[PDB]
Amino acid sequence: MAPVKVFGPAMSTNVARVTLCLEEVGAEYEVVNIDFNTMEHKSPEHLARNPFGQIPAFQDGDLLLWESRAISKYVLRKYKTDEVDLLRESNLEEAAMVDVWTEVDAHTYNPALSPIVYQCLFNPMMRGLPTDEKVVAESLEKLKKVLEVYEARLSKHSYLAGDFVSFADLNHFPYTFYFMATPHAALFDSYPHVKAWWDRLMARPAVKKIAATMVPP
Amino acid sequence: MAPVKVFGPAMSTNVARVTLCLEEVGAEYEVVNIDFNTMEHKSPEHLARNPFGQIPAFQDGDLLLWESRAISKYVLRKYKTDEVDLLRESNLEEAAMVDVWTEVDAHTYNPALSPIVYQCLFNPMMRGLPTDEKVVAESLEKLKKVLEVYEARLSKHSYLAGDFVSFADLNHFPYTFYFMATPHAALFDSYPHVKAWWDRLMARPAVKKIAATMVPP
Numbered sequence: 296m297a298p299v300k301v302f303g304p305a306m307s308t309n310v311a312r313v314t315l316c317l318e319e320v321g322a323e324y325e326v327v328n329i330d331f332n333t334m335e336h337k338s339p340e341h342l343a344r345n346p347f348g349q350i351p352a353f354q355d356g357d358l359l360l361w362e363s364r365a366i367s368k369y370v371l372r373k374y375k376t377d378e379v380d381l382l383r384e385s386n387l388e389e390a391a392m393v394d395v396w397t398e399v400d401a402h403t404y405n406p407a408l409s410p411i412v413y414q415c416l417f418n419p420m421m422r423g424l425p426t427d428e429k430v431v432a433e434s435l436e437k438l439k440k441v442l443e444v445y446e447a448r449l450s451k452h453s454y455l456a457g458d459f460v461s462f463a464d465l466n467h468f469p470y471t472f473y474f475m476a477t478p479h480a481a482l483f484d485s486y487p488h489v490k491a492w493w494d495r496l497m498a499r500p501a502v503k504k505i506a507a508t509m510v511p512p
Numbered sequence: 513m514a515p516v517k518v519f520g521p522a523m524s525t526n527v528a529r530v531t532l533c534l535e536e537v538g539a540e541y542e543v544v545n546i547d548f549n550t551m552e553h554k555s556p557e558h559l560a561r562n563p564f565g566q567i568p569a570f571q572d573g574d575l576l577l578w579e580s581r582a583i584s585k586y587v588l589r590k591y592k593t594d595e596v597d598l599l600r601e602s603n604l605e606e607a608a609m610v611d612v613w614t615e616v617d618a619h620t621y622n623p624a625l626s627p628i629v630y631q632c633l634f635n636p637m638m639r640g641l642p643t644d645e646k647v648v649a650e651s652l653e654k655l656k657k658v659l660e661v662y663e664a665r666l667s668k669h670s671y672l673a674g675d676f677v678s679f680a681d682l683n684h685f686p687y688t689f690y691f692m693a694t695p696h697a698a699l700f701d702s703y704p705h706v707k708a709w710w711d712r713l714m715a716r717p718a719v720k721k722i723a724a725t726m727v728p729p
């Protein structure tokens with residue numbers, strides 16, 4: 296049988312980006328673990344998939360992909376329907392706003408939020424490494440300034456790209472989910488339109504399914 | 513058909529990403545400078561274009577965009593022809609490789625190459641800031657490992673996504689051009705297929721036109 300394969304730990308943020316997209320479009324898939332403890336990500340077998348030796352990678356027949364956003368867009372295109380059109384590529388202005396807010400995640404929001412996840416969650420929980428409180432403080436101040444902008448945006452529309460959910464919103468889910476596992480989760484409550492947006496995403500069945508994979512089973 | 517407008521200094525890397533895409537598709541445009549000396553990027557007029565107060569921004573009628581890659585994709589879609597189709601969105605596997613290598617620029621290549629540009633070129637030439645040789649050395653070692661991967665890829669095809677030029681290749685132009693103005697330019701000679709690809713991009717008429725805009729006096 297023909298499920299597509301995602302390679303990497305299911306709970307890894309960038310894997311969860313891809314599995315969320317797969318769930319949203321109703322595609323059949325399997326997640327194949329990659330064991331970092333044996334350097335499997337640097338094995339020749341995995342380097343054939345991603346020559347830079349990272350996860351996720353992805354296989355659909357003879358096509359091997361890497362870079363979570365590239366994988367995700369392939370999925371969103373391949374399995375597109377009229378009812379689940381998360382890129383909006385037939386409407387140039389809508390597609391442009393999807394792209395803008397996807398880029399805002401990559402270049403503005405995630406660089407502010409991710410260090411807090413690293414320092415407050417990944418460091419202590421993965422290998423028991425310390426937290427750098429200077430990094431956390433600096434990042435929180437940058438994140439507050441980002442959230443001020445998101446608060447204004449999400450007072451004008453229910454989602455980032457307009458009055459429709461899109462890949463832009465989905466891209467914010469994996470790292471933000473882990474931010475909600477840190478002691479700084481309540482920050483979002485100070486930006487009520489951002490909180491309402493987050494709650495809307497968390498209510499989505501595909502998001503619930505992937506959130507359940509981002510915990511300890 | 514009034515020309516579309518690109519806002520920012522013409523020689524800025526992320527402005528040049530956009531103007532290269534505009535030249536490749538033969539679109540009429542104007543570059544409108546944004547004066548950082550008077551904080552014009554933080555003025556209400558510019559914040560209406562990019563609420564994060566960065567350049568580039570872009571206007572087409574009533575549409576305002578920011579984030580250079582989002583602007584660029586809007587351009588490549590709007591002005592697409594069968595002859596100049598730089599995203600390949602009608603072919604899932606080709607679009608996927610364009611997307612992979614666009615992501616590799618953003619998340620792998622540019623993070624290794626751009627600090628060398630900053631330390632060796634932008635620091636001394638813009639404000640007269642010092643150079644951090646530790647940053648340069650660490651970045652060079654990362655870049656060498658990246659270039660090994662590019663060398664293998666560019667032995668299989670003349671361009672990153674396949675046997676056709678695409679947005680993936682164009683994304684590498686602006687920072688790489690400035691890297692070639694640093695004392696480390698010769699690094700590429702150690703990767704003959706990467707150097708041959710670079711020379712092919714530099715031979716393109718659109719690339720020549722934008723390279724001429726990328727000067728200080």
Ligand SMILES: N[C@@H](CCC(=O)N[C@@H](CSO)C(=O)NCC(=O)O)C(=O)O
Pocket residue numbers: 307309336348349350351361362363364619
């Ligand atoms: N931009 C890429 C990031 C992948 C990545 O960082 N993967 C990490 C796991 S998370 O810190 C990884 O595989 N690292 C191993 C390494 O670099 O050796 C994407 O979105 O796919």
Ligand SMILES: N[C@@H](CCC(=O)N[C@@H](CSO)C(=O)NCC(=O)O)C(=O)O
Pocket residue numbers: 402524526553565566567568578579580581
């Ligand atoms: N990912 C974005 C980066 C734009 C940017 O950094 N712009 C800088 C100029 S270059 O260092 C900028 O406008 N900075 C002003 C500021 O952040 O205050 C893009 O691709 O458009």
Ligand code: NA
Pocket residue numbers: 497502503506507
């Ligand atoms: Na849930």
Ligand code: NA
Pocket residue numbers: 503504
């Ligand atoms: Na549930």
Ligand code: NA
Pocket residue numbers: none
């Ligand atoms: Na929860």
Ligand code: NA
Pocket residue numbers: 543544545
């Ligand atoms: Na001007």
Ligand code: NA
Pocket residue numbers: 585599601607
């Ligand atoms: Na595209």
Ligand code: NA
Pocket residue numbers: 664665668
């Ligand atoms: Na290859």
